[PDB]
Amino acid sequence: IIGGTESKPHSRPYMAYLEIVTSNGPSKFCGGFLIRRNFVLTAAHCAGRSITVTLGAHNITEEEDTWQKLEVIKQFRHPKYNTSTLHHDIMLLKLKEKASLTLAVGTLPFPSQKNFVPPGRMCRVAGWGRTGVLKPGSDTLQEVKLRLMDPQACSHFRDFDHNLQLCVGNPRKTKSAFKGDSGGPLLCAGVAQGIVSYGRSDAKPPAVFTRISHYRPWINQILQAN
Numbered sequence: 001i002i003g004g005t006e007s008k009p010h011s012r013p014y015m016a017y018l019e020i021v022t023s024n025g026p027s028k029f030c031g032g033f034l035i036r037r038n039f040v041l042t043a044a045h046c047a048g049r050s051i052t053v054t055l056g057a058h059n060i061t062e063e064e065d066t067w068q069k070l071e072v073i074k075q076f077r078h079p080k081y082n083t084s085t086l087h088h089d090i091m092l093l094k095l096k097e098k099a100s101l102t103l104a105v106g107t108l109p110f111p112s113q114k115n116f117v118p119p120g121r122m123c124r125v126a127g128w129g130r131t132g133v134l135k136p137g138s139d140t141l142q143e144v145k146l147r148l149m150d151p152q153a154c155s156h157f158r159d160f161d162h163n164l165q166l167c168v169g170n171p172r173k174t175k176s177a178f179k180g181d182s183g184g185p186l187l188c189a190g191v192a193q194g195i196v197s198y199g200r201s202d203a204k205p206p207a208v209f210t211r212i213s214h215y216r217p218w219i220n221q222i223l224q225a226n
């Protein structure tokens with residue numbers, strides 16, 4: 001998160017910190033959010049050979065009783081995810097066991113309605129990602145308020161599409177999500193409407209988020225079958 005504030009500790013109890021293992025490199029990191037006691041939603045590009053989820057964290061360098069380090073048994077990447085266009089950048093992780101409900105750990109379930117969210121309003125995103133182009137990931141959970149933009153604002157991303165994705169962040173400000181924040185939720189009036197996907201390498205906003213409403217049928221299909 002660039003240009004944000006430190007979250008009040010444990011104030012976003014659905015937030016998940018992902019450590020991703022691959023065969024031929026060191027650990028990589030993403031965000032995510034708990035939508036059922038045994039399911040975390042995140043980005044498809046955060047997939048790997050294996051993943052560990054930490055719930056209940058604020059400062060990710062300091063072990064505490066709120067932590068739950070949970071095993072992932074299976075990864076469900078969207079079947080149409082495309083590594084060139086980055087369309088359909090969404091994935092569900094099934095946990096080996098159901099998480100414990102505490103003050104610091106709880107689900108963010110979707111409401112019944114899945115209305116298409118138009119441009120104009122302010123939304124909030126949180127993560128442990130880089131705080132600048134040349135700065136490491138944050139030790140503490142950070143968050144920032146961003147403007148939902150008209151789709152033409154993201155035209156320079158040649159594979160952006162308005163039906164699939166949200167365009168997020170006023171170009172006149174530095175405020176943005178960045179590397180390490182991918183997979184985290186964008187909340188508009190307390191309701192998850194987007195998932196951090198990608199942006200420019202120089203972190204100039206706006207950035208591109210997966211539009212959750214488009215994928216509600218697919219999410220439901222996976223949850224009901226597993």
Ligand SMILES: CC(C)c1c([C@@H](C2=C(O)[C@@H](C(C)C)NC2=O)c2ccccc2)[nH]c2ccc(F)cc12
Pocket residue numbers: 028029030045046086176177178179180181182196197198199200201202203207
């Ligand atoms: C384009 C790039 C600057 C970028 C990324 C990267 C990236 C991650 O997400 C992590 C992952 C693989 C552990 N390491 C990376 O290099 C990316 C995105 C999509 C596909 C592959 C890689 N994420 C962003 C999030 C917000 C943003 F504004 C920009 C970016």
Ligand SMILES: [Zn+2]
Pocket residue numbers: 009010058064066
């Ligand atoms: Zn604590």
